[PDB]
């Protein structure tokens, strides 16, 4: 049984970062050579394991998270980071054991006029627990007046679109990210 890593990396759509997908991987054999020998993965950093030696190890579960962020923000998909992605969208644990890979997805995820499908959380009153992610849409109260479920002044929709534009510098382009956890 090949572990369905093709379904994750060669997926048609990816998820928004505030709503990142997770695929549990159980009861199979996975070929990690096909990953480190890919000219496409601009980021391939591994924590607690060595990338080559990943075909010689066994775990009781493997988790596969996928989402889209800005290249400037792949810096935050690492243990011990802060910022709007790490704090309000996707948080890794300090004791992470796994790998994080990313690759420029300008050709599939940006268009002229801007692709607005991808979203991130802008407003949250408290930092996110690791692997603990909320799908909520309640508008954010930034004043002392209750908002009563109406978007307005000091009463902001908590999500914001990346508006991926094709022309921008590299740091602003969409990057698809896959996080492998080993437990």
């Amino acid at each position, epitope marked *: 049984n090949l572990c369905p890593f093709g379904e994750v990396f060669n997926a048609t759509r990816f998820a928004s970062v505030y709503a990142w997908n997770r695929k549990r991987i159980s009861n199979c054999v996975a070929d990690y050579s096909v990953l480190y020998n890919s000219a496409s993965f601009s980021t391939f950093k591994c924590y607690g394991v060595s990338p080559t030696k990943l075909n010689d190890l066994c775990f009781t579960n493997v988790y596969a998270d996928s989402f889209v962020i800005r290249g400037d923000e792949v810096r935050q998909i690492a243990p011990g980071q802060t910022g709007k992605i790490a704090d309000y969208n996707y948080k890794l644990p300090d004791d992470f054991t796994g790998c994080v890979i990313a690759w420029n997805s300008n050709n599939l995820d940006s268009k002229v006029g801007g692709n607005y499908n991808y979203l991130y959380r802008l407003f949250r009153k408290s930092n996110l627990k690791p692997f603990e992610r909320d799908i909520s849409t309640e508008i954010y109260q930034a004043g002392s007046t209750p908002c009563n479920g109406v*978007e307005g002044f000091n009463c902001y929709f908590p*999500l914001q*679109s990346y508006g991926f534009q094709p022309t921008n510098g590299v740091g602003y382009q969409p990057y698809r990210v896959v996080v492998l956890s080993f437990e």
Partner: antibody, heavy 125, light 113 residues
Framework: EVQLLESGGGVVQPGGSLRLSCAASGFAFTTYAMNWVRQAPGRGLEWVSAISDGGGSAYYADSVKGRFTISRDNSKNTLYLQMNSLRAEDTAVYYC??????????????????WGQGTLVTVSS | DIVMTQSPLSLPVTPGEPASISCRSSQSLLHSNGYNYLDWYLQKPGQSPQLLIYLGSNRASGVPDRFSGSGSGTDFTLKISRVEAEDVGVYYCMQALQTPGTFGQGTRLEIKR
């Protein structure tokens, strides 16, 4: 930057069908409810239909229930009006309009912030 | 359904003079949350309609300050403090509570020139 492009809509023989499209452009279309509103030549606005973000909830005016279908393709940011059993009283200018708010009590059918330029539908022999 | 009654159906105004459109509603539009769910739309000739006031008293983005919404419950009013030539068109009130979205019959602002 927001703009809403209506297409479809020409002459439709009575009793026939027609599909209207609305192409949304410069905003987080996936997060907003959408509306179709109608204006018959020489007359006022009549609301016809509304749909929440990502489908799921739809609402229709009395005069179009059973015959009309509002639908949404969040993949490529398009709104649809399926028009069956068309009639003389459906000859009108049709336009999609974006719901202003996005909160709980903003309501799918409510305040409409931006409107398209419209598309004229003519039911005639 | 909620019936919206606009008055008058035609309003002649001298340029510079203020104007007032009345809109009465079947049921109270006062939501539990304190907001009155009334909208004001304007359709300039040849253009598609345009939001002036939402939730009774809030000017929409880009709307000048001489446009004004007041009232509560069932009696609402749109006031244009200085009417000017660009304002000509048809004004519609609309309730935003319930699923039959119902418009007032529209008021043709004439400019008594």
């Amino acid at each position: 930057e927001v703009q809403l492009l209506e297409s479809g809509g020409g002459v439709v023989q009575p009793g026939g069908s027609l599909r209207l499209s609305c192409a949304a452009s410069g905003f987080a279309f996936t997060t907003y409810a959408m509306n179709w509103v109608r204006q018959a030549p020489g007359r006022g606005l009549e609301w016809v239909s509304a749909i929440s973000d990502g489908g799921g909830s739809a609402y229709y005016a009395d005069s179009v229930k059973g015959r009309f279908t509002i639908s949404r393709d969040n993949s490529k940011n398009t709104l649809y009006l399926q028009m069956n059993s068309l009639r003389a009283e459906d000859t009108a200018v049709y336009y999609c309009a974006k719901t202003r708010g996005r909160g709980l009590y903003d309501y799918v059918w409510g305040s409409k912030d931006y409107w398209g330029q419209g598309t004229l539908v003519t039911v005639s022999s | 359904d909620i019936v919206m009654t606009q008055s008058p159906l035609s309003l002649p105004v001298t340029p510079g003079e203020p104007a007032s459109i009345s809109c009465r509603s079947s049921q109270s539009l006062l939501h539990s949350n304190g907001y009155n769910y009334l909208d004001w739309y304007l359709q300039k000739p040849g253009q598609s309609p345009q939001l002036l006031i939402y939730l009774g008293s809030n000017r929409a983005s880009g709307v000048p300050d001489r446009f004004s919404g007041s009232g509560s419950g069932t009696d609402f009013t749109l006031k244009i403090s200085r009417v000017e030539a660009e304002d000509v068109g048809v004004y519609y009130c609309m309730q935003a509570l319930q699923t039959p979205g119902t418009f007032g019959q529209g008021t043709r602002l004439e400019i008594k020139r």
